[PDB]
Amino acid sequence: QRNEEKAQREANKKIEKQLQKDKQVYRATHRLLLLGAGESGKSTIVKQGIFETKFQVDKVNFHMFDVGGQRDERRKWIQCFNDVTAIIFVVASSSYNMVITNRLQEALNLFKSIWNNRWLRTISVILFLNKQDLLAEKVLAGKSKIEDYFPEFARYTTPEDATPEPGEDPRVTRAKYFIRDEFLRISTASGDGRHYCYPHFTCAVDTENIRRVFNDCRDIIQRMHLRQYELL
């Protein structure tokens, strides 16, 4: 009676003291969700049920989730990831001709479905446009033209404020920027400043992807704070 009540309070205090230590670790970690189009080469990106990985850059802890145990066209489980910092979307940009409705259109439909969601209404997306060397190799050779698959490409011009590389043939730059604009117009169509999209061009020999993720997360948090304080 009298002794039993004191015993319960003793165990509660020890547990509540442990929960304070766990709260410090929980609040200092950033969670990321990794998605793919099915054959986008996202395993190479992470190489260099649910699968979890941990990494640290500049004394900041990141923790990324990859889902491979569930494969369906109705993502009922996606409402759990409404508190993550950002979503990483990996798409193969060199699969316009491949049909096995081509794969770029399916990837665009998936991106459009994810963007306009009731739960992911305040979450930014980091977009990786993988397989650039394959795209350049396919574009440079003839008999394979995006016009035969994307009729809108017949009236596209490379933007004046573009950033071509040193040795690129100007043919490939137009295709790259067309593919990027396809995602960008969907991103900006329904955006009200609550979240943005950060597209990048990625290859197989790239090694600075973790720096890109770090900088994009920093920008995401800074923009969130600026919008919160009515400064943006």
């Binding site: 319960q8 649910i50 145990g69 109705r74 759990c80």
Partner: protein, 331 residues
């Protein structure tokens, strides 16, 4: 040929239950005096979870309960004195369900790792791990101290043997994700609500489906038997709740309002079965009248959407959880 016969058989089932509809439930209960106005107040508030809460299960003694959260914890409370008894950290941070054994010696857990874990309270360490599902677990209930039934996202349910960790029987027939299940008072039948807007009645001993109900038009989120055991209620994401009768093989009443457009997350009955409590996405709960389909109360003390709900065995209190990492006891 094969497809043609199915359409002919479907009409026979529909016509069979059309002649039995002599009168409606609401027509019979027109002379019953209304229950009136029901007002409830919060008695306790439980704090300590670091993230949103998805699951909750009362104890058989109506004193202790368990809850789950996305931070990776499984806390057992003392609702009377508001004292934490246990805090089990989970290997995987993605949890969707939890259960509390009738004897009180075990607790189950599951989620996005396609695995159900059983913990030994009175010994806390992992006792068994059940594998074989190819989709995320949605619910789990203890039949006994040595057997448990689970539902997953691979459109199947299973009955497990805890001692050997092997599936005794498997239930198939759904086409979408199975979202919830509930056991009968005598533990011989159970019902399941899936994403194809259908509910089914299974036989644990034999392993065959008995009846199918398809009155809804969206994904079914929650399900619960009537205390008698001859009826059950469902809740979908079209802001409607429906009552189905096992013996009549058809639905009897619908609970909806023109000012509600959000989805429904959980349902539960009261001790006598007169009241029906349902949680919604508009951050608050509602109380219905089972025999009349009219509102009688509102519980609006939660900041974020309510994800779970439960009523004690003796019917003394109602517990609700929401995404603001808080539990509340309403009396």
């Amino acid at each position: 040929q094969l497809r043609q016969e199915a359409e002919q058989l479907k009409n026979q089932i529909r016509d069979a239950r059309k002649a039995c509809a002599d009168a409606t439930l609401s027509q019979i209960t027109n002379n019953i005096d209304p229950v009136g106005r029901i007002q409830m107040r919060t008695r306790r508030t439980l704090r300590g979870h670091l993230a949103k809460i998805y699951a909750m299960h009362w104890g058989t003694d109506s004193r202790l309960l368990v809850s789950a959260s996305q931070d990776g914890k499984l806390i057992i409370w003392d609702s009377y004195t508001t004292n934490k008894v246990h805090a089990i950290p989970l290997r995987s941070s993605w949890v969707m369900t939890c259960a509390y054994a009738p004897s009180g010696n075990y607790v189950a857990c599951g989620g996005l790792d396609n695995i159900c874990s059983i913990y030994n309270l009175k010994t806390v360490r992992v006792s068994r791990e059940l594998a074989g599902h190819t989709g995320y677990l949605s619910c789990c209930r203890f039949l006994d101290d040595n057997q448990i039934v689970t539902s997953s996202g691979d459109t199947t349910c299973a009955l497990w043997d805890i001692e050997t960790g092997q599936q005794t029987t498997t239930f198939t027939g759904h086409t979408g994700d199975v979202m919830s299940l509930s056991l009968a008072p005598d533990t011989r039948l159970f019902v399941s609500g899936a994403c194809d807007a259908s509910a089914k009645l299974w036989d644990v001993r034999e392993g065959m489906c008995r009846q199918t109900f398809t009155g809804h038009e969206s994904d079914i989120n929650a399900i619960c038997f009537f205390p008698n055991g001859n009826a059950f209620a469902t809740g979908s994401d079209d802001a409607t709740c429906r009552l189905f009768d096992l013996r009549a093989d058809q639905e009897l009443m619908t609970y909806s309002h023109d000012n509600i457009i959000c989805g429904i997350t959980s349902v539960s009955f009261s001790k006598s079965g007169r009241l029906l409590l349902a949680g919604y996405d508009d951050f608050n709960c509602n109380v219905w009248d089972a025999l009349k389909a009219d509102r009688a109360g509102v519980l609006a003390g939660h900041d974020n959407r309510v994800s779970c709900l439960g009523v004690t065995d003796d019917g003394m209190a109602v517990a609700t959880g929401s995404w603001d990492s808080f539990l509340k006891i309403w009396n």
